[PDB]
Design a protein around this ligand. Structure first.
Ligand SMILES: CCCCCCCCCCCCCCCC(=O)O
Ligand SMILES: CCCCCCCCCCCCCCCC(=O)O
Lengths: 250, 272, 150, 58, 272, 58, 250
């Protein structure tokens, strides 16, 4: 019924039988730049199916005690095949993203997570008079982990979950496009995120357009004898990718 | 206009329709209104939503910054300077940070006041003071002294004002490099990510310089200038959660971990 | 420039910073830009060979957008935007630098965010002259704004 | 060459004029008005339309 | 309007056309645009060139000159005078010298300030000062004293102003002998070439005289007047190379030999 | 007897009035406007016209 | 006049003032595959300007005693930026090529070389009962060198020039699309080579569609005092590149 969906992009298809309706940006479906809104003069590269296919990020295990996980996108996909190579070879680029987050469990398991995509998710440092390290902010496809308590270190991210890493209430993250995975309701959630910026195109290494956060508001809980290994896996595909400024690779 | 939705009368219902139940997991709000849960009367609600508009929320002149300068000092060091930075002020910063991106014109007002310093000098009667405020864009000549040629101001805009007149006022058009000002920047200045990280990488909005344009007088005077900002014609995009932590720095978003609400005795307690 | 025993040597180079670099800051384009804070538009560089008429050769004129440092070899330089300049009857060749920026405007001043990228030149071939001809010769470079400039 | 528009008044119980004196639009006073709202982009960002009276699932 | 040229899409080219090559020797620039060298996309460039117009470049009020006078002195010698000369100020002179010839009206603004001198006098409380600025064209009567009849001003224009009011303002129409003001003059005043050489041979624009119009008071006061110039309706001809040497004199173009650019380690160095 | 003209606005998203109060044109405010440009007198001061796509010589 | 030409592809332009008329295949200008002539079913990748730009191969010096040089194309361009990456990531691909060969010299220098592009230029081994080594056949952008005399070695290519490496007379190579660089006539030669095969698309690592050979029929000669360093340089651009069969990179 409306619980079943299938998405085909490039050479990859994801079929889901128990899912939420698809959340779409701020009501905007991703498109290519118009002549009216353009900067760079060179004819852009449009890899089409070469990069618009789905890629899978490293899976994580959901513990009953887990505080949550996050990824930054332009960085997360930097080694993802040709998407990766096209950003490694260009000064400017643009793409939207389809984010499909999966976590199946038996009917006897309970818990619930927020799946949210947040633009410009600039991070605060655990040490006040300092800035966070590059590896504390992103590890490519490896998720970073939120802390259950206040954390510390000179280049550490203040990862305490309750402030979402940025000094806001975690409970107010629902402003941003989001969807929930409630184990009694569905196995997956889908968010479509258009490119959002102050500029038509940008440098894909210096700036992370958005961060994906997975936050367990209701921790995983189960009876004994039930399966103890319950993974969360994330699969993403760029859309309408465009590149400008072909150059010596970085 | 911008009138609040009114209320439609609603009688008893016995049917298969289920406005009461939904799926929050889907990422949208319920559209349920009182007519769907209880019997209602018609209400011609004439209330408007004008104060909720973005323009009204932001168009107030906030104090952003203030500094001081004196009419006496060492080797011409009698001027104040301030790097434009709207993040040094807690209340305005908070309001502005509600939107990720914004495009607006900015109206400025200055309030200039002064006072006497403790002195042993008799005969301090002095003429009315006139002040000069000059804006130097990035890369312009810089004052190093109050009597420097850098104050000639052949191109750089500036304002001269005499005490007792209405406070100075001026309009600044939207000036970004991009199509909006960013409130947040999840990135680095450099490609090797070795420069600073965060919003301050985009802050290259110039500096104000301020001084008296009178000569010195034996009676020492200290002056204070308050700079006020009033955004106009403001269009905003992508709202964000308001901050719960108190601000620590103007150059970043570092924060002290903070709880989400004041506590109470129990979950059923009325005394919050 | 001169006759070389090796291929692919570097002729010249500089960053694209019209309002700051010593190469451009005092040229007419620089002098005007020094009265502005922000700028935008495409730029032309004209290279005029001033060697003898009996001398020939070829050069690589290239622009490398930011995100990588300046090219360290012709092999890398050639991966950017470029023109192969054949020195022949026509003495001048023009390298057009396209507008490439994440922004509509760049800063006149040096700035890390609005990074300029690099302009370099490499030999394509050797400068070849006959006997009793001086191989040592000079090239003049001229700069101006394109029609799309503000 | 002034324009004429209305003043905000209370509902369920008037014109004023406005001339621009400057050559730059940045000099104009704030664009305060009722405008319009479209909350659906934030409250209903969903591809498949939900019906208020219907079950969300199936 | 004054819109920058836009960009036309351009596909692959294989032909005898050679937009890439020219002859600089001919004295004209290349007209090559990006569509001629690389494949392009269409760009609807909406940028304008308004700030580049001559009028905007020059119409700012620059400080040109300032001087002082006192309310006490010897034998009536309490007035300031200044020969009109726009070459005494480095920033304005530089901008004006970019054009060989120019025709414009000039708007003037004065900024008048004052201060107390060190004194042993008690009881210095004084009434508000009023100042007189008078212009004397070449050949007019000249003040020799602050109380001279030369200040009657029956014809010569003048302005009287009281401190605390807005600064004085006045418009001067284009006044040249010729059809434009010359910025440069490669010639001599005399036919035997025995007078001065250069631009100062044409400078016969009159003198300003300034004084207080109050009487003296026991408390000594020193006043400073800054004169500001804002050209309007400016038409210019024949642009010139901007100066690299620093100015030495207001009366000529003598200069200290100067290099053409800051140096660097090598011709391939990125660090300039 | 005021004239009505437009304000400068941003491109790709208004009138104001102007009355003269003086008998002398020198009293009018600056003639700021887009005007027009004609760079050819400085960039192409050549008797024999060059064609952009053609060789400069012959 | 007809001696001057300019070619613009992608973000690169080559302008030549002294050149021969352009030689084009077998009268065929390179194009993309038609629906009528197709195998692979997946939607192809068309990088367009990303790969259709010019690349420059390592230059060589022309000695008065040099026997000649050669390159194999799919191998020559295997590391050439994104052209390289797209073949590294695909099972099948197709492209035509523009080959521009340059060698300038003073009017006082003399000599003449054949610039020829030869399809299926399968090489014979110097040792009869053996096969040639991979490095003896191709060194990417580094040219292989022909021998002036009969050569030897178990995995050596029988590189003697007179047999063009394949047992045919060198003087008959003119069948294949070719052009000459005669120092008294021009500085460069241009050959356009369409894709030629028994199949619509092929594997770009297992097969070399054609080999470029540069052969000095008339050796370089000059008087003393004249320039002694006279290089030959080769620049090439793929056209209408298409890729199919996106896969784990090789
Ligand atoms: C002396 C009179 C002229 C005054 C000119 C001052 C202009 C300073 C720049 C003001 C705009 C700053 C906008 C910052 C907004 C943001 O980045 O979030
Ligand atoms: C006291 C009030 C009247 C003031 C009258 C002052 C008129 C002085 C002349 C100003 C014009 C000078 C123009 C010089 C331009 C040039 O030669 O390059």
């Amino acid at each position: 019924s409306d619980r079943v969906r299938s998405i085909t992009l490039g050479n990859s298809t994801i079929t889901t039988q128990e899912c939420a309706n698809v959340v779409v940006g701020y009501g905007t479906w991703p498109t290519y730049l118009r002549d009216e809104e353009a900067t760079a003069e060179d004819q852009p590269t449009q890899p089409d199916v070469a990069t618009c296919r789905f890629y899978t990020l490293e899976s994580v295990m959901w513990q009953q005690s887990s505080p949550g996980w996050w990824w930054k996108f332009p960085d997360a996909l930097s080694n993802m095949g040709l998407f990766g190579q096209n950003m490694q070879y260009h000064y400017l680029g643009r793409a939207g993203y389809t984010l499909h987050v999966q976590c199946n469990a038996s009917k006897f398991h309970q818990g619930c997570l927020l799946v949210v995509c947040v633009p410009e998710a600039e991070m605060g440092c655990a040490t006040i008079a300092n800035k966070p390290d590059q590896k504390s902010l992103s590890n490519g496809e490896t998720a970073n982990v939120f802390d259950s308590q206040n954390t510390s270190g000179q280049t550490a991210v203040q990862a305490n979950v309750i402030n979402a890493g940025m000094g806001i209430g975690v409970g107010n993250l629902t402003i941003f496009p989001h969807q929930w995975i409630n184990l009694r309701t569905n196995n997956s959630a889908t968010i479509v995120m258009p490119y959002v910026n102050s500029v038509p195109m940008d440098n894909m290494f210096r700036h992370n357009n958005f961060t994906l956060m997975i936050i367990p508001f209701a921790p995983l809980s189960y009876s004994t004898g039930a399966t103890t290994y319950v993974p969360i896996t994330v699969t993403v595909a760029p859309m309408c990718a465009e590149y400008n400024g072909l150059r010596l690779a970085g | 206009i911008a009138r609040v939705a009114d209320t439609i009368s609603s009688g008893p219902v016995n049917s298969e329709s289920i406005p009461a139940l939904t799926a929050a997991e889907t990422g949208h709000t319920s559209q349920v209104v009182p007519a769907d849960t209880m019997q209602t009367r018609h209400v011609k609600n004439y209330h408007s939503r004008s104060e909720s508009t973005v323009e009204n929320f932001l168009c107030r002149s906030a104090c952003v910054y203030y500094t001081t300068y004196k009419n006496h000092g060492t080797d011409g060091d009698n001027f104040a300077q301030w790097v434009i930075n709207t993040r040094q002020v807690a209340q305005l910063r908070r309001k502005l940070e509600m939107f990720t991106y914004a495009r607006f014109d900015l109206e400025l007002t200055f309030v200039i006041t002064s006072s006497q310093e403790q002195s042993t000098i008799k005969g301090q009667d002095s003429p009315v003071l006139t002040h000069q405020i000059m804006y130097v864009p990035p890369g312009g000549p810089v004052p190093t002294k109050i009597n420097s040629y850098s104050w000639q101001t052949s191109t750089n805009p500036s304002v001269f004002w005499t005490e007792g007149s209405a406070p100075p006022r001026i309009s600044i058009p939207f000036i970004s490099i991009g199509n909006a000002y960013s409130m947040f920047y999840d990135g680095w200045a450099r490609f090797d990510k070795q420069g600073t990280y965060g919003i301050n990488t985009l802050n290259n909005m110039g500096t104000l310089y301020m001084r008296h344009v009178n000569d010195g007088s034996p009676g020492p005077i200290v002056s204070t200038v308050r700079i006020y900002f009033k955004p106009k014609h403001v269009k905003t995009w992508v709202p964000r959660p308001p901050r719960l932590c108190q601000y620590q720095k103007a150059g970043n978003v570092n924060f002290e971990p903070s709880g989400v609400t004041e506590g109470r005795t129990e979950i059923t307690a009325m005394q919050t | 420039v001169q006759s070389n025993s090796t291929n692919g040597s570097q002729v010249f180079g500089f960053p694209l910073i019209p309002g700051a670099s010593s190469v451009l800051n005092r040229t007419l384009l620089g002098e005007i830009l020094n009265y502005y804070t922000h700028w935008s538009g495409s730029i032309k560089l004209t290279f005029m060979f001033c060697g003898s008429a009996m001398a020939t050769g070829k050069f690589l004129l290239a622009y490398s957008p930011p995100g990588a440092g300046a090219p360290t070899t012709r092999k890398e330089a050639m991966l950017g935007t470029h023109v192969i300049w054949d020195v022949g009857l026509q003495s001048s060749c023009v390298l057009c630098i396209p507008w490439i920026s994440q922004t509509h405007y760049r800063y006149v001043v040096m700035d890390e965010y609005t990074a300029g990228g690099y302009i370099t030149c490499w030999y394509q071939t050797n400068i070849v002259v006959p006997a009793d001809t001086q191989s040592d010769c000079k090239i003049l470079c001229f700069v101006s704004a394109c029609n799309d400039f503000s | 060459g002034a324009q004429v528009s209305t003043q905000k008044t209370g509902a369920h119980e008037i014109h004023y004029t406005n001339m621009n004196y400057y050559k730059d639009s940045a000099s104009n006073s704030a664009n305060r008005q009722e405008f319009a709202q479209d909350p659906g982009k934030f409250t209903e960002p969903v591809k498949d339309i939900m019906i208020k009276s219907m079950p969300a699932l199936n």
